[PDB]
Amino acid sequence: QVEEMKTQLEELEDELQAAEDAKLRLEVNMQAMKSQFERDLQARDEQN
Amino acid sequence: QVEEMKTQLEELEDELQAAEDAKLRLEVNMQAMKSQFERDLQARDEQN
Amino acid sequence: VFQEFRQRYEILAANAIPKGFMDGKQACILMIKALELDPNLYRIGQSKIFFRTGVLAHLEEERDLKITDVIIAFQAQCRGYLARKAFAKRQQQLTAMKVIQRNCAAYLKLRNWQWWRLFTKVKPLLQVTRQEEEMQAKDEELQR
Amino acid sequence: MKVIQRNCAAYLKLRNWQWWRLFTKVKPLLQVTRQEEEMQAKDEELQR
Amino acid sequence: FSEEQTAEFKEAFQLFDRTGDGKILYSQCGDVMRALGQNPTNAEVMKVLGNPKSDEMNLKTLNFEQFLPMMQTIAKNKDQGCFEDYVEGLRVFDKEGNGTVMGAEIRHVLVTLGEKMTEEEVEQLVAGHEDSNGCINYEELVRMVLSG
Amino acid sequence: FDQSQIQEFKEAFNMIDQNRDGFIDKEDLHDMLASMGKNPTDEYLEGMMSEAPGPINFTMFLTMFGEKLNGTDPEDVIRNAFACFDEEASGFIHEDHLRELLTTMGDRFTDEEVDEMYREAPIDKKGNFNYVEFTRILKHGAK
């Protein structure tokens, strides 16, 4: 059970690191897409 | 006591992993939708 | 003229006027008959209508006291529409602002770290990727 | 006529220098292609 | 009402806070209310705002606690001016019934009638829909304002 | 993590690792700054070696610059957020406008931010501020 708890803590830390990386990348992607689409709409309106 | 703590940690890890998977799926879907909308806006700007 | 005044002031009393518009002259005759105005206060005409002084002011006020409802209703509606539009605009601007904010705050945290001057002195030296990307950028620029 | 002296003296004192010869060898050996073609295309497009 | 939409209510309330705690000026909270679909005239706003004066409106803010009964009273209106009202009134407001309504007259009778608004308000309202005839199709703009 | 960033970091590292051992020591940065100018005082070198668990290895400074940098955004999306921020779309907003907006944009900001920005930005002589090159400087285009 000590070995199983160690393995469970390892799996939990791995899942938490993966989730943190995924959340950071997803926030970056969402912010980037929003800003880029808004700026593209603004530039298209300016070009029109 | 250690077994109860490990069970609580495993339950919390499973719940947080399900939540993070749902959030990552939603964020990837939103990023894909934003990229598609940006491509559509570019095509619409060219048509305009 | 008949039709102008008719369509402009029938709001006061359009109760029993036949929706099928009869002779515009006859239509304004019957509409002012319903308006209960003294003949001498105006001048019925074959093509236009003529009125005394200050009578239009009375008619303007009588008209104005009926439109206020529509006035305030549409005013509130359009104000709320402008409000929600500016709200969406400002919240999008605030999202962009939060992005810029995180970036400049990270810069603040990093503009003073000693390693920065060091590793920024060296970046302008190696530019092979910069050289290539500028080659293609100048290619498309020259083509444009 | 006092700036041409530096140029000619440099070219002479490096022409016999074997290291300058090595440099003027390695650049046509495998180095002229990318940068030289880039700059040539740039100059041609600019002249056009 | 319900906590169902109170999450969006909370994020919008704290979104336009100049102090970032839950205290938003009376003018600003009325503007948020209008931005929330519920756009009543400032008359009933002040009526349910304890009947304050302009100074109190620009100095006194509101917590989110009292904001719930406030939108509750706003929801007691349960309806506003109808669409057929606006279309028929604008149609009868024109001079000749030519499917449209002149622009300058609209701007004037909007900034100088009943509820007062600044000129740029109605300007950016009508902006984009202008035409060389100066007669804008009231129908498209009124349905855009109603639906939007 | 970014391909361009990691590739340029390792490029600059293998260029500065004059011993090519993957271990950054006092020799490398010392002689580099000597060729650049005044040699760095060895206490600065030790303090720069205090963050890593030893002689700065490749992944060492990789992780350190990651944890010090992961969270920013490239100049592209920066100027994108800056674009709709201005109606003129020329990138010439006023710095005192930046001040009046920064004090309450989202969370409240203080005065040190704006004074440092003005003292470290090419502002014009009335307030107008250009970011077409300043934001690239923030991403190290010129500084």
TrEMBL record, chain E:
| Gene Ontology MF annotations | calcium ion binding; structural constituent of muscle
Q: What does the organism's lineage look like at the top?
A: Eukaryota, Metazoa, Chordata, Craniata, Vertebrata
Report the protein name in the record.
Myosin light chain smooth muscle isoform
**Quaternary context:** Myosin is a hexamer of 2 heavy chains and 4 light chains.
Q: Is Disulfide bond one of the keywords UniProt gives this record? A: no
* Residue span(s) of domain EF-hand: 4-39, 81-116
Q: Does the keyword 4Fe-4S apply?
A: no
| Record keywords | Motor protein, Muscle protein, Myosin
Q: Give the transmembrane ranges.
A: none
Q: Which GO terms describe its cellular component?
A: cytosol; myosin II complex
UniProtKB/TrEMBL annotation, chain F:
Is Calcium among this UniProt entry's keywords?
A: yes
Q: Any idea which UniProt keywords this protein has? A: Calcium, Metal-binding, Repeat
What is the superkingdom listed in this entry's lineage?
Answer: Eukaryota
Traced from the root, the source organism's taxonomic lineage reads:
Eukaryota, Metazoa, Chordata, Craniata, Vertebrata
Any GO molecular function: calcium ion binding
Per UniProt, where does Mg(2+) bind? D17, N19, D21, D28
Designated gene of the protein: MYL9
Protein name (database record): Myosin light chain 9
Q: Where is the EF-hand domain?
A: 4-39, 73-108, 109-143
- Quaternary structure and interacting proteins, as annotated: Myosin is a hexamer of 2 heavy chains and 4 light chains.
